Design an enzyme around this catalytic site. Structure first.
Site, PDB file in Angstrom:
ATOM      1  N   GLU A 100       0.837  -1.188   0.000  1.00 33.34           N
ATOM      2  CA  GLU A 100       0.000   0.000   0.000  1.00 33.34           C
ATOM      3  C   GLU A 100       0.869   1.234   0.000  1.00 33.34           C
ATOM      4  OE1 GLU A 100      -3.054   0.174   2.920  1.00 33.34           O
ATOM      5  OE2 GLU A 100      -3.099   2.369   2.944  1.00 33.34           O
TER       6      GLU A 100
ATOM      7  N   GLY B 223     -11.739   1.850   5.418  1.00 33.19           N
ATOM      8  CA  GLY B 223     -11.390   2.272   6.759  1.00 33.19           C
ATOM      9  C   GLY B 223     -11.774   1.200   7.749  1.00 33.19           C
ATOM     10  N   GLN B 224     -10.960   1.021   8.788  1.00 38.02           N
ATOM     11  CA  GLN B 224     -11.237   0.011   9.797  1.00 38.02           C
ATOM     12  C   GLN B 224     -12.526   0.345  10.509  1.00 38.02           C
ATOM     13  OE1 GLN B 224      -6.965   0.896  10.824  1.00 38.02           O
ATOM     14  NE2 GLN B 224      -7.267  -1.011  11.949  1.00 38.02           N
TER      15      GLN B 224
ATOM     16  N   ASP C 157      -5.994   9.093  -0.180  1.00 40.76           N
ATOM     17  CA  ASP C 157      -6.736   9.628   0.958  1.00 40.76           C
ATOM     18  C   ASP C 157      -5.860  10.579   1.755  1.00 40.76           C
ATOM     19  OD1 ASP C 157      -8.853   7.983   3.449  1.00 40.76           O
ATOM     20  OD2 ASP C 157      -8.072  10.025   3.404  1.00 40.76           O
TER      21      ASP C 157
ATOM     22  N   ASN D 170      -1.687  -8.973  15.969  1.00 41.92           N
ATOM     23  CA  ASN D 170      -1.263 -10.213  15.347  1.00 41.92           C
ATOM     24  C   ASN D 170       0.202 -10.441  15.709  1.00 41.92           C
ATOM     25  OD1 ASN D 170       0.418  -8.616  13.806  1.00 41.92           O
ATOM     26  ND2 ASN D 170      -0.837  -8.745  11.956  1.00 41.92           N
TER      27      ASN D 170
ATOM     28  N   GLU E  33       2.747  -7.489  14.839  1.00 44.88           N
ATOM     29  CA  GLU E  33       2.492  -6.384  15.746  1.00 44.88           C
ATOM     30  C   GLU E  33       2.986  -6.659  17.168  1.00 44.88           C
ATOM     31  OE1 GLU E  33      -1.642  -6.360  15.018  1.00 44.88           O
ATOM     32  OE2 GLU E  33      -1.373  -5.579  12.986  1.00 44.88           O
TER      33      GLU E  33
ATOM     34  N   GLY F  55      -9.300  -9.120   9.670  1.00 44.50           N
ATOM     35  CA  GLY F  55      -8.746  -8.781  10.969  1.00 44.50           C
ATOM     36  C   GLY F  55      -9.651  -7.883  11.796  1.00 44.50           C
ATOM     37  N   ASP F  56     -10.362  -6.977  11.137  1.00 46.51           N
ATOM     38  CA  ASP F  56     -11.267  -6.069  11.831  1.00 46.51           C
ATOM     39  C   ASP F  56     -12.461  -6.886  12.312  1.00 46.51           C
ATOM     40  OD1 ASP F  56      -9.690  -3.780  11.111  1.00 46.51           O
ATOM     41  OD2 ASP F  56     -10.777  -3.620   9.195  1.00 46.51           O
TER      42      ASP F  56
HETATM   43  N1  ADP Z   1      -8.575 -17.253   4.473  1.00 44.03           N
HETATM   44  C1  ADP Z   1      -8.719 -17.048   5.796  1.00 44.03           C
HETATM   45  N2  ADP Z   1      -9.528 -17.890   6.530  1.00 44.03           N
HETATM   46  C2  ADP Z   1      -9.703 -17.718   7.861  1.00 44.03           C
HETATM   47  N3  ADP Z   1      -9.047 -16.704   8.478  1.00 44.03           N
HETATM   48  C3  ADP Z   1      -8.232 -15.836   7.823  1.00 44.03           C
HETATM   49  C4  ADP Z   1      -8.037 -15.987   6.433  1.00 44.03           C
HETATM   50  N4  ADP Z   1      -7.217 -15.033   6.057  1.00 44.03           N
HETATM   51  C5  ADP Z   1      -6.889 -14.303   7.130  1.00 44.03           C
HETATM   52  N5  ADP Z   1      -7.515 -14.801   8.212  1.00 44.03           N
HETATM   53  C6  ADP Z   1      -7.427 -14.286   9.631  1.00 44.03           C
HETATM   54  O1  ADP Z   1      -7.567 -12.853   9.721  1.00 44.03           O
HETATM   55  C7  ADP Z   1      -6.349 -12.267  10.187  1.00 44.03           C
HETATM   56  C8  ADP Z   1      -5.919 -11.135   9.272  1.00 44.03           C
HETATM   57  O2  ADP Z   1      -5.738 -10.016  10.169  1.00 44.03           O
HETATM   58  P1  ADP Z   1      -4.410  -9.123  10.173  1.00 44.03           P
HETATM   59  O3  ADP Z   1      -3.185  -9.925  10.319  1.00 44.03           O
HETATM   60  O4  ADP Z   1      -4.492  -8.065  11.197  1.00 44.03           O
HETATM   61  O5  ADP Z   1      -4.408  -8.489   8.727  1.00 44.03           O
HETATM   62  P2  ADP Z   1      -5.436  -7.646   7.899  1.00 44.03           P
HETATM   63  O6  ADP Z   1      -5.767  -6.377   8.868  1.00 44.03           O
HETATM   64  O7  ADP Z   1      -4.763  -7.253   6.618  1.00 44.03           O
HETATM   65  O8  ADP Z   1      -6.708  -8.401   7.631  1.00 44.03           O
HETATM   66  C9  ADP Z   1      -5.327 -13.381  10.315  1.00 44.03           C
HETATM   67  O9  ADP Z   1      -4.542 -13.281  11.508  1.00 44.03           O
HETATM   68  C10 ADP Z   1      -6.126 -14.666  10.325  1.00 44.03           C
HETATM   69  O10 ADP Z   1      -6.305 -15.210  11.648  1.00 44.03           O
END
Ligand code: ADP
Length: 467
Positions: A96, A120-121, A211, A305, A308, A450-451
């Site tokens: 990004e 946006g989150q 943005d 995660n 982080e 993730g959100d």
């Molecule tokens: N295909 C998927 N199936 C189930 N869970 C997923 C999948 N892809 C991502 N996730 C979950 O969602 C999270 C992604 O959140 P994060 O690492 O904060 O990144 P992002 O904010 O880019 O989504 C991962 O930690 C994982 O547990």
């Protein structure tokens, strides 16, 4: 007592369906949630080889390919934009960059998008919590043109408007104004995409951010002035979008300008006993990262995660721990989580990664586990359908097989800690909850998972504990 993997798999099946039912009944108990700071538009373009091909040759796949190896800071050229998309196709990793040129900005629009969705989150969380879970939601929307306002799903979603020295809460569509469109152009490619010579090893995406408001976390007048009035309307709060802050800006301003405003919001939230969750997204700037960590004590909950958690460990000085955490060692993760709680005194930490979630809390109870289980189902549903609309769709996720390796991993937690129930560990002055998750092979959206994970567990756990 020995426990075969097939029995364990059966046991978690029951827990999952129970968590779900428990969550559906508790959600109606949450009075309101304030989603703060980042909201925008997500313009999605499903990449087409021929198009990208035709497009790269045009500018001249010369400079373009030079960008793949020597990627720039921001996007100030059309070469930098295409070189960036390709590179993201190469490493197959999510990127990004911030578009600085108005010239490239015109390029982006002309290129167009396949579909539009809230961004946006805070925005994504608003449509989920408000539209799907139907929890009365109040959200921060920096610029609200008609294009933005209509991305909000119908439901109890509100925006605060100063109606003549009277703060009113109205739906976005009823608060449209002649403001800027804050667009994030998202370009996605499948697990196998074909361009020039380069192949994509995984289905990822490149984001061209045009943005200017969320980049500096500009706050609406109502949030800078009627915050106490707003707060009076909610039980919980989820803060995000701060990971963008830089230490210094060319106009002589600094991150402190913003954090000072944010810290006073946390104090008002505290003053009203509003439970708040902070989404500690990766913060590249160290000074800003350190500042955010010092703000943690003022939050009730945190979500993060692996990358982080490790990043916090580095600045906290625990450099050996961060390394193992990045290594994905689960007993190291738990260590880092306990260190962080010792360091900040924070009430709850929800850690999520691929395969399992962990939650360290000072209070005890099954609600923490069921909440993590509901969040796992919500994340699977989301990845499955790409777009959620009704709380029922989440029921479909129950058919998704639970991560078997995470199940095998529980056995080791079992011999190490005092599990008093499945996924529940009693500690001297805190509880640890573990939950094997549901991975969806080849997911649809994957944009706001993730959100989805963090907000769903935080909110539902609270409704369940509210009892
Ligand atoms: N295909 C998927 N199936 C189930 N869970 C997923 C999948 N892809 C991502 N996730 C979950 O969602 C999270 C992604 O959140 P994060 O690492 O904060 O990144 P992002 O904010 O880019 O989504 C991962 O930690 C994982 O547990």
């Amino acid at each position: 007592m020995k426990e075969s993997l097939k029995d364990r798999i059966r046991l978690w099946k029951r827990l999952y369906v129970n968590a779900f039912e428990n969550a559906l009944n508790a959600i109606p108990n949450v009075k309101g949630v304030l989603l703060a700071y980042n909201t925008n538009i997500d313009a999605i373009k499903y990449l087409d080889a021929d198009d990208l091909e035709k497009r790269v040759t045009e500018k001249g796949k010369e400079k373009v390919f030079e960008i793949i190896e020597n990627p720039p800071e921001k996007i100030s050229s059309i070469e930098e934009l295409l070189g960036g998309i390709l590179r993201s196709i190469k490493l197959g990793k999510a990127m990004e960059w911030f578009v600085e040129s108005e010239e490239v900005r015109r390029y982006l629009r002309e290129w167009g998008w396949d579909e539009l969705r809230i961004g946006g989150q805070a925005g994504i969380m608003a449509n989920l919590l408000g539209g799907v879970y139907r929890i009365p939601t109040i959200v921060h929307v920096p610029q609200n043109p008609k294009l933005q306002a209509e991305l909000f799903v119908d439901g109890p979603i509100y925006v605060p408007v100063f109606e003549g020295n009277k703060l009113k809460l109205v739906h976005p569509k009823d608060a449209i104004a002649e403001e800027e469109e804050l667009i994030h152009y998202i370009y996605e490619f499948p697990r196998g995409f074909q361009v020039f010579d380069v192949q994509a090893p995984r289905e990822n995406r490149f984001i061209a951010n045009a943005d200017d408001y969320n980049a500096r976390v500009y706050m609406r007048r109502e949030f800078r002035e009627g915050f106490e009035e707003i707060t009076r309307n909610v039980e919980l709060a989820i803060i995000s979008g701060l990971q963008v802050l830089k230490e210094y800006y060319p106009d002589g301003t600094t991150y402190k300008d913003v954090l000072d405003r944010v810290e006073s919001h946390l104090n008002i939230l505290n003053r009203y006993n509003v439970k708040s969750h902070f989404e500690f997204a990766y913060t590249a700037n160290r000074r800003v990262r350190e500042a955010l960590v010092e703000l943690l004590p003022k939050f009730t909950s945190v979500g993060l995660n692996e990358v982080e958690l490790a990043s916090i460990m580095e600045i906290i000085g625990d450099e050996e721990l961060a390394k193992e955490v990045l290594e994905g060692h689960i007993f190291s993760v738990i260590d880092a989580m306990n260190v962080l709680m010792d360091e900040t005194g924070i009430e709850r930490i929800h850690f999520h990664t691929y395969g399992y979630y962990l939650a360290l809390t000072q209070y005890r109870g099954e609600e923490v586990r069921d909440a993590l289980l509901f969040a796992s189902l919500a994340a699977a549903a989301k990845a499955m359908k790409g777009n959620l609309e009704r709380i029922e769709q989440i029921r479909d996720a129950l058919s998704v097989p639970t991560n078997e390796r995470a199940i095998v991993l529980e056995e080791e937690l079992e011999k190490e800690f005092t599990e008093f129930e499945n996924g529940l560990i009693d500690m001297v002055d805190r509880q640890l909850a573990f939950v094997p998750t549901k991975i969806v092979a080849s997911p649809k959206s994957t944009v706001g998972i993730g959100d989805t994970i963090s907000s769903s567990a935080f909110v539902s756990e609270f409704g369940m504990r509210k009892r």
